[PDB]
């Protein structure tokens with residue numbers, strides 16, 4: 001998160017910290033959010049050989065009783081995810097066991113409505129990602145308020161698609177999701193509407209988020225069958 005604030009500790013109890021393991025490199029990290037006691041939603045590009053989820057975290061360097069470190073049994077990457085275009089950048093993680101409900105850990109279920117979100121309004125995104133181009137991931141959960149932009153603002157991303165994705169962040173501000181914030185939720189009036197997907201290496205906003213509304217049928221299908 002660039003140009004944001006430190007979250008009030010445990011104020012976003014659905015937030016998930018993902019450690020992603022691959023065979024031929026060190027750990028990578030993503031965000032995500034708990035939508036059921038045993039399901040986390042994140043980005044498809046956060047897939048790996050194995051993943052561990054930590055719920056209940058604020059400062060991810062300091063172990064505390066709120067932590068729940070949870071095993072992932074299965075990854076459900078969107079079947080049409082494309083590594084070239086980055087279309088359909090969404091994935092569900094099934095946890096081995098159901099998480100405990102505490103003050104610090106809870107679900108963020110979707111409302112019944114899945115209305116298309118138009119440009120204009122302010123939304124908020126959170127994560128443990130880099131706080132600048134040359135800075136490292138944040139030890140503490142950070143968050144920032146960003147503007148939903150008209151789709152033409154993301155035209156320079158040649159594979160951007162308004163039906164599939166949100167265009168997020170006023171180009172006149174530094175404020176942005178960035179590297180390390182992958183998979184984290186964009187909340188608009190308390191409702192998850194986007195997932196951090198990709199942007200520019202130089203951090204100039206806007207960035208591209210998965211439009212959750214488009215994938216509500218697919219999400220429902222996985223949750224009902226597993």
Ligand SMILES: COC(=O)NCc1c(C(=O)O)n(Cc2cccc3ccccc23)c2ccc(F)cc12
Nearest residue numbers: 028045046177178179180182197198199200201207
């Ligand atoms: C768990 O594996 C990773 O994290 N891999 C690295 C990786 C990242 C990142 O470092 O998070 N992002 C988000 C991203 C990359 C650049 C500028 C951005 C600008 C804004 C927002 C996100 C941005 C990706 C997107 C697509 C992709 F195939 C790989 C990545």
Ligand SMILES: [Zn+2]
Nearest residue numbers: 009058064066
């Ligand atoms: Zn605490």
